[PDB]
Amino acid sequence: MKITNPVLKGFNPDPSICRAGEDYYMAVSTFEWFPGVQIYHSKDLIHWRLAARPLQKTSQLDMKGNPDSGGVWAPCLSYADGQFWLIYSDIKVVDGPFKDGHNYLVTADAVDGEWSDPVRLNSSGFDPSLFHDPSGKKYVLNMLWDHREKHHSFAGIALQEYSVSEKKLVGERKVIFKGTPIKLTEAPHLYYINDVYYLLTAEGGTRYEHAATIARSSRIDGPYEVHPDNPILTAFHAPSHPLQKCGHASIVQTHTNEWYLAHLTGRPIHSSKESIFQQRGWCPLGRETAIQKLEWKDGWPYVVGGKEGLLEVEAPAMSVKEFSPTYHIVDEFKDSSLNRHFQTLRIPFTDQIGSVTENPHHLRLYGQESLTSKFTQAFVARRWQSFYFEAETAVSFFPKNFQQAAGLVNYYNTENWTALQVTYDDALGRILELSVCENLAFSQPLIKKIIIPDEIPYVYLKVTVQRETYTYSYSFDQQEWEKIDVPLESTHLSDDFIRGGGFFTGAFVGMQCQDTSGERLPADFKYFRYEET
Amino acid sequence: MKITNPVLKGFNPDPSICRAGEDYYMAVSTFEWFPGVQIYHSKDLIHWRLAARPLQKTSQLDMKGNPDSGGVWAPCLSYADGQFWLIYSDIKVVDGPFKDGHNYLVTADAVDGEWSDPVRLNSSGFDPSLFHDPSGKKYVLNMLWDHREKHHSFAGIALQEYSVSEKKLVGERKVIFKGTPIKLTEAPHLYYINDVYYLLTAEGGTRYEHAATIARSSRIDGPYEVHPDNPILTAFHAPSHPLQKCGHASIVQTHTNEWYLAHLTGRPIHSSKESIFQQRGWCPLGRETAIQKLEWKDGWPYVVGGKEGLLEVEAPAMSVKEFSPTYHIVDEFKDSSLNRHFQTLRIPFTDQIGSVTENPHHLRLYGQESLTSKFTQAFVARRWQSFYFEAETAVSFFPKNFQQAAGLVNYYNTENWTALQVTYDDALGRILELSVCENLAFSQPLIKKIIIPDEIPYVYLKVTVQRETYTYSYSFDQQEWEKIDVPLESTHLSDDFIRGGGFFTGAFVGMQCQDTSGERLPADFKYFRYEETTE
């Protein structure tokens, strides 16, 4: 059987792969979505289950107010000395000359167990990584961010020893590698292989110039010599390749003595009226995770099939293990916790915003701030993970003023979303309203406003996504449906469309309630269906 | 003696004036600056002292991450039933279709006492105000914010009863007033005068179309009849008038039976190459507070001297009461509390960012995030309150890497500031570097870097503000000052220059340290001089 790429579909960037015995884990970045970090598990590298989200407490991760695509950037997950180590960031500034953000370490005995509270590491640049040197010494790597006007912002790869006993970085940091002319050198990961240190980095930025670079040295602090056919992974030169933005990689040696390379990639939708060489495409599924196979020659690794990456990769010599599903196709909210594929923006799910117990078999959302707020939104959502799917909910909501609205949302960031919501109009009563926010340009295009009769206990809401286009429809009895004939562009919910310094997540679909009057009016959602078609 | 306007200079907007006996107070907005709300006190309406900053605890005001010019918008201060009542807002969203923000009520027996924990009122629009009806009932007014595409966002003035005993609004809200064609109707305040309800509002927005309008009704919920010579306050038609943006007013009747109108105003700097009618000016001192006298005719008040406002205003018949200064020209940081004119961005001053006791007679700042961060900045600052002044400090700072810098800062918001900082360069060692951030465009224009010798214990830093321009200078000895040949424009630190949805504060000058490496390297400031030199 082959590995079929991407192995993590939808928003799952910056994969950090590691091994514990015959178990394999990958951590991916989550930015402003809470809880933070997703860890997937596999026994064959083909099939991956969502196993854990470590950062569940505000003591670990406090992101209220964080900018769009701030928060948890690339993480580093490792296993050594009988425990898992997770290095993560909380980025507070994502535009301008600075990139204010802080790097932390937590540990756990199992990925789905309780994680420690964080140790502060440094703030000097993102993509922090923990390297377990064969000696037993530990080192933290990260990129150095240089704000100064006259310097490239990616000032190279810093190395500094981490003292387990002092719970701090010690000594002085050293810049061990400045990168290649591709620049934007980041994502440092160190490997010790046959008594040689290999430094893997990403270069080119995470758009279409993305690459994975590798260098090697007999000493941990260099100097490092670059791979003769560098970069080892990129699709920069190949605009028509189905995998784009190929970079930010990590390496695993399997227990079967085989070598594999996890990396992020985008799968763009193109415009037929543009050249793909000039307009490389739009990715509503964000940056996904793919796995390539490596082969070695003369002490350098090479990506099997060429540096562009393959859609179908030769799987390692392991028994196939498919996993039980981890979400309900129709979630009826029978569980005491929200299913693990649901996340909230920035803050934990508490009765500040909602409850799964107050009205049994419903998700109740207490109306809070609008979809444009970086603070407290009663919004529970899950990733688009296919170009073709339907999502559906049913909402009991009886608003009494125009500042109350609840329903079904497709969302990229606070400036980019659409929403089909039950709201209230003083002259007409309950109405069903379409709202559109495109880089903070707001529109409500329905001239024909849809009146909802008083006797309808639930309004059924649906979105049908068909690659480049998606459309809403609604029903008052879940039998006769009415299409909202406003075709919406999926590419408007993509990394490549939205403005600003942070463009790092992906499209989500979810259930939402706002009450900007102050009443905290609740909306009860009977179910949430997500069905890929 | 007359009232000389502005009575509160520099950033002091949205004045809410009230009387307690023969004491007069004004609350002004503070936006992202902490602690929140400033209350001033006067015995004669001529002289005002900074008396209190009520919102001191994160339990009352938690602004970490707030956008620039979010946070504490216009407040409402009132005195009734033996206590002070303060209505304030925490605005989370300042651009786009929404204006997410929440309104709260706190109380105190004295304005500089301990204020209560907040009661939640509503979230339906900013400028909340508490009216004490002669029936003994209480009402909250606020503007209603309408996000809907096809409606003007200022949908009128809401009114709803507040229950003291239940600690919540009760009944249902009513829209009691929709405004005039000036629109952007906000700042509602109710007054009950000669058995008539008078509703005062601001219209036209807080730029150069700002106005105060007033309307009256025999019933609290209207309909209200508009003043026949409305608006009663505005400089919209008079671009050359020295007071501009005149609006967001509040009324007080003195214990001497006289009537006054406090209002915000801007004092713009103009460009000689533009028409003042097209480019109405730039205000680095932000929105300031002025007071006018009112006179009545046929049940309507009129501003004495015309709708535009006067610089010198007839004072009430009260004994003059001057106050002595509430800051030292040269603050040597001998006190263990920061002087009341210093504020921090968004968060309280704690060991997270500094200490005035760790190194006695110095302000120590532990290097945290850059000047562009909306979270944790080790930055202690005070308002520009004069067009002409000098500010000066002396810093002990020994950075070891380029991500550590500390010094003297002039600042409007996270995207707009300049900084003269001791930093480290791997090729030169300690250097003194000038950084400039203009609507997030960043430059360091000194071609030749200024090297600091190792043996210098303190670097002396000065800014000389000269109305439309300001310049930095420095000294290693405190006796010989070296020029920094970069002219900077004061108008770039103004409400009228900066981009974005919130433009509501004013220029500050302060002491700052950043360490974006993680070491929290300390900088020690020996003193802070702020010396105004107007006249």
Resolution in A: 1.7
Distance from CA of A265 to the nearest CA of B (A): 30
Q: What are phi and psi of B80, to 5 degrees?
A: -165, 155
Give the angle subtended at the CA of B420 by the CAs of B418 and B425, to the nearest 5°.
Answer: 120
How many other CB atoms are there within 10 angstroms of residue B59's CB atom? 9
What is the C-alpha separation between A294 and A429, in angstroms, rounded?
63
A122 to chain B: nearest residue by CA?
A: B518
Q: Which method, experimentally, gave rise to this model?
A: X-ray
Contact B370 A98 (CB under 8 A): yes
Beta strands in A369-428 (DSSP E): 378-383, 388-396, 404-413, 416-425
Nearest to A191 by CA among A204, A200, A203: A200
B471 interfacial to chain A (CB closer than 8 Å): no
Distance from CA of A350 to the nearest CA of B (A): 18
For the record, the structure tokens of B200 come out as 């005062």
Q: Are residues A396 and A440 in the same domain?
A: yes
B9 interfacial to chain A (CB closer than 8 Å): no
Q: Taking a C-beta distance cutoff of 8 angstroms, is the pair B197, B219 a contact?
A: yes
A519 to chain B: nearest residue by CA?
A: B122
B98 interfacial to chain A (CB closer than 8 Å): yes
**Element spanning A475, H or E:** strand A469-475
Task: Give the structural domain span for A66.
Answer: 1-326
What is the C-alpha separation between B289 and B249, in angstroms, rounded?
9
Widest distance between CA atoms in chain B: 77
Q: Taking a C-beta distance cutoff of 8 angstroms, is the pair A382, A327 a contact?
A: yes
Q: Taking a C-beta distance cutoff of 8 angstroms, is the pair B471, B465 a contact?
A: no
Contact A443 B516 (CB under 8 A): no
Contacts of A219 (CB under 8 A, 6+ apart): A197
Q: Taking a C-beta distance cutoff of 8 angstroms, is the pair B289, B74 a contact?
A: no
What is the C-alpha separation between A506 and B11, in angstroms, rounded?
41
Residue B210: CATH number of its domain: 2.115.10.20
Q: Are residues A347 and A365 in the same domain?
A: yes
**Element spanning A473, H or E:** strand A469-475
Contact A103 B518 (CB under 8 A): yes
For the record, the structure tokens of B211 come out as 């106005």
B121 to chain A: nearest residue by CA?
A: A518
What is the C-alpha separation between A67 and A63, in angstroms, rounded?
9
Task: Give the one of A98, A376, A442 whose C-beta lies nearest to B96's C-beta.
Answer: A442
A271 interfacial to chain B (CB closer than 8 Å): no
Contact A373 B121 (CB under 8 A): no
What is the C-alpha separation between A440 and B334, in angstroms, rounded?
49
How many other CB atoms are there within 10 angstroms of residue B151's CB atom? 10
Q: Taking a C-beta distance cutoff of 8 angstroms, is the pair B371, B512 a contact?
A: yes
CB pairs under 8 A between A and B: 132
What is the C-alpha separation between B373 and B379, in angstroms, rounded?
11
For the record, the structure tokens of A29 come out as 């970045």
What is the C-alpha separation between A360 and B22, in angstroms, rounded?
59
Q: Are residues B333 and B197 in the same domain?
A: no
Q: Are residues B368 and B458 in the same domain?
A: yes
Contact A370 B97 (CB under 8 A): yes
- Last residue of one domain, picked from the residues B290, B306, B326: B326
Q: Are residues B371 and B395 in the same domain?
A: yes
Give the distance, in angstroms, between the CA of residue A100 and the centroid of all CA atoms in the same chain.
Answer: 20
Exposed/middle/buried for residue B398 (C-beta within 10 Å: 0-12, 13-18, 19+): middle
What is the C-alpha separation between B308 and B325, in angstroms, rounded?
31
Contacts of A436 (CB under 8 A, 6+ apart): A418, A442, A443, A444, A445, A488
Write down how long chain A is: 533
* Residue that the structure tokens 């107010």 belong to: A65
Write down how long chain B is: 535
Distances (CA, A) of B72 to A40, B162, B380, B525: 43, 21, 19, 29
Give the angle subtended at the CA of B181 by the CAs of B178 and B187, to the nearest 5°.
Answer: 50
- Last residue of one domain, picked from the residues B303, B326, B349: B326
Contact B369 A92 (CB under 8 A): yes
For this structure, is B186 an active site residue? yes
Q: Are residues A252 and A370 in the same domain?
A: no
Contact A148 B124 (CB under 8 A): no
B201-210 per-residue burial string, b: 16 or more CB within 10 A, e: under 16: bbbbbbbbbb
How many other CB atoms are there within 10 angstroms of residue A134's CB atom? 9
A418 interfacial to chain B (CB closer than 8 Å): no
Task: Give the one of A121, A437, A518 whose C-beta lies nearest to B123's C-beta.
Answer: A518
Q: Taking a C-beta distance cutoff of 8 angstroms, is the pair A43, A326 a contact?
A: no
Amino acid sitting at position A53: R
Q: Are residues A352 and A317 in the same domain?
A: no
Distance from CA of B290 to the nearest CA of A (A): 33
Q: What is the number of structural domains in chain A?
A: 2
Give the angle subtended at the CA of A364 by the CAs of A361 and A368, to the nearest 5°.
Answer: 170
Q: Are residues B455 and B423 in the same domain?
A: yes
Q: Are residues A476 and A368 in the same domain?
A: yes
- Active-site residue numbers of A? 14, 186
What is the C-alpha separation between B7 and B290, in angstroms, rounded?
5
Residue to substitute from B62, B100, B140, interface A, most A β-carbons within 10 A: B100
Contact B96 A124 (CB under 8 A): no
Q: Catalytic pick from B90, B186, B288, B438? A: B186
Distance from CA of A518 to the nearest CA of B (A): 4
Q: Are residues B133 and B164 in the same domain?
A: yes
- Last residue of one domain, picked from the residues B286, B305, B326: B326
Q: Taking a C-beta distance cutoff of 8 angstroms, is the pair B521, B424 a contact?
A: no
For the record, the structure tokens of B503 come out as 């433009």
What pairing do the DSSP bridges indicate for beta strands B211-217 and B196-203? Answer: antiparallel
Q: Taking a C-beta distance cutoff of 8 angstroms, is the pair A125, A144 a contact?
A: yes
Q: Taking a C-beta distance cutoff of 8 angstroms, is the pair A70, A94 a contact?
A: yes
Distance from CA of A97 to the nearest CA of B (A): 6
Q: Are residues A410 and A437 in the same domain?
A: yes
Q: Taking a C-beta distance cutoff of 8 angstroms, is the pair B384, B284 a contact?
A: yes
Q: What are phi and psi of B490, to 5 degrees?
A: -60, -30
Bridge partner list, A293: A260
A181 interfacial to chain B (CB closer than 8 Å): no
Q: Are residues B292 and B228 in the same domain?
A: yes
Residue A454: CATH number of its domain: 2.60.120.200
Q: Taking a C-beta distance cutoff of 8 angstroms, is the pair A216, A197 a contact?
A: yes
B501 to chain A: nearest residue by CA?
A: A440
Quick check: helix, strand or coil at residue B492? helix
What is the C-alpha separation between A69 and A379, in angstroms, rounded?
17
Nearest to A5 by CA among A315, A226, A348: A315
Q: Taking a C-beta distance cutoff of 8 angstroms, is the pair A139, A161 a contact?
A: yes
Q: DSSP labels for B209-278?
A: T-EEEEEEESSTT-PPEEPTT--SEE-TT-TT-SSEEEEEEEEEE-TTS-EEEEEEEE--B--TTS-TTT
Contact A444 B123 (CB under 8 A): no
Helical segments of A45-190, H only: none
B chain contacts of residue A148, beta-carbon cutoff 8 Å: 402, 444
What is the C-alpha separation between A315 and A470, in angstroms, rounded?
35
Distance from CA of A354 to the nearest CA of B (A): 18
Number of helices (H) and strands (E), helices first, in chain B?
0, 42
For this structure, is B415 an active site residue? no
